[PDB]
Amino acid sequence: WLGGLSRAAFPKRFVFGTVTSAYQVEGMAASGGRGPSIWDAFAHTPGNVAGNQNGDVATDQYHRYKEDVNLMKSLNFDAYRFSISWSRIFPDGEGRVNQEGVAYYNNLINYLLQKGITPYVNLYHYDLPLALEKKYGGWLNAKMADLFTEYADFCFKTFGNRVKHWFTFNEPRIVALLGYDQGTNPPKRCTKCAAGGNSATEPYIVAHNFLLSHAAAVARYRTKYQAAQQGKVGIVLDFNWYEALSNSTEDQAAAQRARDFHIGWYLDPLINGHYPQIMQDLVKDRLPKFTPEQARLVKGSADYIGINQYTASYMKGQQLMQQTPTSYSADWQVTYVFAKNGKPIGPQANSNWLYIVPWGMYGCVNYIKQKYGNPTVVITENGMDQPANLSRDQYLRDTTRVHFYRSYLTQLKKAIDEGANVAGYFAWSLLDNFEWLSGYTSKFGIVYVDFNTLERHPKASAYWFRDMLKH
Ligand SMILES: OC[C@@H]1[C@@H](O)[C@H](O)[C@@H](O)c2[nH]cc[n+]21
Ligand SMILES: [Zn+2]
């Protein structure tokens, strides 16, 4: 049932944790002095989320955080990845501090440390203060580097004597893709969209500003706080694996373009100080140019790379064509394929995009090892979902999730035993929670949350982790 996995199967002092994000678990969305984020406005508009649900209450971790910390300690985890809500600290994103918000994160951080659990703190997880969206146009505006740097500075000052493991952003690719290419997440921008936009240009502007903002915040950390605090700052990037459908030159090149457009988009700047060459060749003057000084600030600005790894796809190629620009997604010039030799790549979880493909974990980790000089990587999310409307006991008997983690972690072990510099692994999620457009219809937790009573109940997968992680 453990399949030979234990702490002895991973490197000495490998970090095991679970993950949430602020809007997905906290609740108290319009209480405790918190200002609205772009997701509050989006979720409150009829038809945007499944069942018109929102994160007003969520799991109510805001009031129950000590229960949840005790629970993660009893399951033998070493660390907890959570995010700080920018609008809980600065209701307008700038100016006035909400002291009640500050006290909440102080209390959470202090309790975690009291119970021997290491906090890994994300500054941003999709939840841009609405005031900054309206006043500045959000991530389309280069001024976000200053605005984010001032917010990060406050967080380093206020929490950094205790917090030593920071991330700036969670998955800027998804913000760019869903917010500005397809227009399905806030601010709902795209070429077609009612709010305006341009799917060929805005995704690249947004990504550039995430990178400049990350670099500016880290430069602030390094010049003002690191000497005294001695912590680290990284960034979280999504990476799903792409496998060539066949060994042809065409299909191998398609898979590699997909890798470069997905992960290279951010990794090449963070490691090598430039965008991928293929992106420069295909996107051209729609891709912003780093000045030498900006490139030098961005290069080497992550002390570790967070990887959110879930799934994999086959990629099929074609001849590279001259084309009128339409979108970030169309720029790749690839065809997604989800079967090979008459067999699917894997079975799906509840989320249509989530194909259960354990060898993709090996694919991603090995690729980053071999291509980017083996940087320090943390697996910052990995997990799968159950559907809505099951009984409690059905949720608890999550044998598919047990199998998911045994398989994926075996594949992670394989990459590490071959020399990949992976420092940690974090399971998405500690709790069933608000799953963005799916609302409460998608259950990612190792702990079940009854959303009528808010009671927590560990699933078999939680007990699997407890067995596997015991000292
Ligand atoms: O879809 C499940 C989870 C979300 O709940 C997280 O917020 C997000 O970080 C993410 N990226 C990939 C998968 N997921
Ligand atoms: Zn409450």
Residue numbers in the entry: 6 to 476
Give the text the authors published on this PDB structure.
Among all the plant enzymes, one of the most well-studied enzymes is rice (Oryza sativa L.) Os3BGlu7 β-glucosidase, originally designated as rice BGlu1, which was identified as a highly expressed iso-enzyme in rice flower and geminating shoot. Rice Os3BGlu7 acts as an exo-β-glucosidase on β-1,3- and β-1,4-linked gluco-oligosaccharides and also exhibits transglucosylation activity toward these substrates. Rice Os3BGlu7 and a set of closely related plant enzymes including rice Os3BGlu8 and Os7BGlu26 and barley HvBII were found to have both β-glucosidase and β-mannosidase activities. Most β-glucosidases are thought to catalyze hydrolysis through a two-step retaining mechanism involving two catalytic carboxylate residues (two glutamate residues for GH1 enzymes), one of which serves as a general acid/base catalyst and another as a nucleophile.
Initially, we soaked the Os3BGlu7 crystals with 50 mM MIm, as in that paper, but found GIm rather than MIm in the active site upon refining the structure. When a new batch of MIm that was carefully purified was soaked into crystals at 10 mM, GIm was still observed after refinement, while soaking at 1 mM MIm gave a weak GIm electron density in the active site. The GIm was bound in the −1 subsite and formed hydrogen bonds with Os3BGlu7, including N175 and E386 at O2H, Q29, H130 and W441 at O3H, Q29 and E440 at O4H, E440 at O6H and E176 at N2. The conformations of the GIm is consistent with the 1S3 → 4E/4H3⧧ → 4C1 conformational itinerary proposed for β-d-glucoside hydrolysis by Os3BGlu7 and other retaining β-glucosidases. In contrast, MIm is displaced by a slight contaminant of GIm in the crystal structure. Our MD simulations showed that, indeed, unlike the mannoside-preferring Os7BGlu26, which binds MIm through intermolecular interactions similar to GIm in the glycone-binding site, the glucoside-preferring Os3BGlu7 prefers to bind in a relaxed E3/4H3 conformation in the active site entrance. This suggests that the energetic cost of distorting MIm to the B2,5 conformation for optimal binding in the −1 subsite is not sufficiently compensated by the −1 subsite interactions, while binding with relaxed configuration in the active site entrance is more energetically favorable.
